[PDB]
Design a protein around this ligand. Sequence first.
Ligand SMILES: O=C(O)/C(=C/c1c[nH]c2cc(Br)ccc12)SS/C(=C\c1c[nH]c2cc(Br)ccc12)C(=O)O
Ligand SMILES: O=C(O)/C(=C/c1c[nH]c2cc(Br)ccc12)SS/C(=C\c1c[nH]c2cc(Br)ccc12)C(=O)O
Ligand SMILES: [Ca+2]
Ligand SMILES: [Ca+2]
Ligand SMILES: [Ca+2]
Ligand SMILES: [Ca+2]
Ligand SMILES: [Ca+2]
Ligand SMILES: [Ca+2]
Ligand SMILES: [Ca+2]
Ligand SMILES: [Ca+2]
Lengths: 173, 173
Amino acid sequence: EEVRQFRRLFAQLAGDDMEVSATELMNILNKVVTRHPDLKTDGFGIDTCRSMVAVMDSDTTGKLGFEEFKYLWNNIKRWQAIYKQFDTDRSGTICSSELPGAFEAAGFHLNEHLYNMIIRRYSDESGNMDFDNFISCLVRLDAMFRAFKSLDKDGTGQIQVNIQEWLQLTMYS
Amino acid sequence: EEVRQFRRLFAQLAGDDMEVSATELMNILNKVVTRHPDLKTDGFGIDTCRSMVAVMDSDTTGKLGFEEFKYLWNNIKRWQAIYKQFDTDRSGTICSSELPGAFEAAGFHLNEHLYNMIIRRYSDESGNMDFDNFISCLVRLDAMFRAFKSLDKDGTGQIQVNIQEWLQLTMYS
Ligand SMILES: O=C(O)/C(=C/c1c[nH]c2cc(Br)ccc12)SS/C(=C\c1c[nH]c2cc(Br)ccc12)C(=O)O
Ligand SMILES: O=C(O)/C(=C/c1c[nH]c2cc(Br)ccc12)SS/C(=C\c1c[nH]c2cc(Br)ccc12)C(=O)O
Ligand SMILES: [Ca+2]
Ligand SMILES: [Ca+2]
Ligand SMILES: [Ca+2]
Ligand SMILES: [Ca+2]
Ligand SMILES: [Ca+2]
Ligand SMILES: [Ca+2]
Ligand SMILES: [Ca+2]
Ligand SMILES: [Ca+2]
């Protein structure tokens, strides 16, 4: 049903090597947002898309297999709905006061300091975040929570990170 | 003298707020790299410059002050010299086989696994890395080593962090 449409989508996007490259992902995300005039964006750039692919590429093939792509695509589908719901002035962007509500709706309850850091890193000079920056941020945030969770086997809220794992987790992202 | 020139050029670049934004940095790196055609590039994009600024913004103003800028600039100047030196076929690009000499000359000794990841994230389908990607990689890799070492004064090879700390450390595009 939806399982067959999705499988078709992935097959046609992934093409001859049966995995989704950064460039394939970039072209599809740009194709789709082009149809949503309520999402303001200067575009999905290659560098951003290589970042998204690396962070999602948990088997280190270089590209996104079916499950990796499914996980990402379904996140974006939920996250775009959130963005539109929380763009309560229809600017096409998420401003500083809209951001906490949006991230919280996505399951990320941060604190003022962390929201300010993300606005600082991801939002523009007026404190507005456009749609590709918003998705780029959430992919990584979601990945970073997941990485923490894997390392926190005993549920102490502290993790021990060796230098090798640190370099992999930050450089292959 | 060189010191006076550097201060003038920074003052001119930083303008009214006396700090260098990601957009200001993008513009000057694109203007300078165009004068060095041996450094082949598809350009410095805004996302890559926002990341550089973020990783260099140690007083969290959101932009690079004089000392933060100088430090990034001096690294870029050393690193461009290494890129030219280790580009032995003169392709304007750093191939997989040229990369470790270059990283070794920058002071970094990474295992094969980490090279594979960096090559997948930053080089093309032929294993060639262009100049903006080489610089983006090195600015990040340096910053990540420096971050880890700051938190591991004793050289245990490990750091311990909570979720807040982990997010502050990693939430870098
Ligand atoms: O449920 C799904 O898989 C959907 C996929 C989808 C929607 N439009 C598409 C266009 C192409 Br060319 C392929 C696949 C498409 S419909 S949900 C939706 C918005 C939505 C879903 N993913 C999005 C990504 C981006 Br970038 C922008 C908008 C997206 C809606 O109902 O509006
Ligand atoms: O060759 C040039 O264009 C140089 C420009 C230059 C020197 N000092 C500058 C200060 C600012 Br705020 C802007 C431009 C300046 S002199 S060579 C140099 C560094 C260097 C060499 N190649 C480079 C490429 C890129 Br992209 C960035 C810097 C590069 C230097 O003297 O530091
Ligand atoms: Ca493919
Ligand atoms: Ca993969
Ligand atoms: Ca808004
Ligand atoms: Ca954007
Ligand atoms: Ca400025
Ligand atoms: Ca600063
Ligand atoms: Ca070469
Ligand atoms: Ca490039």
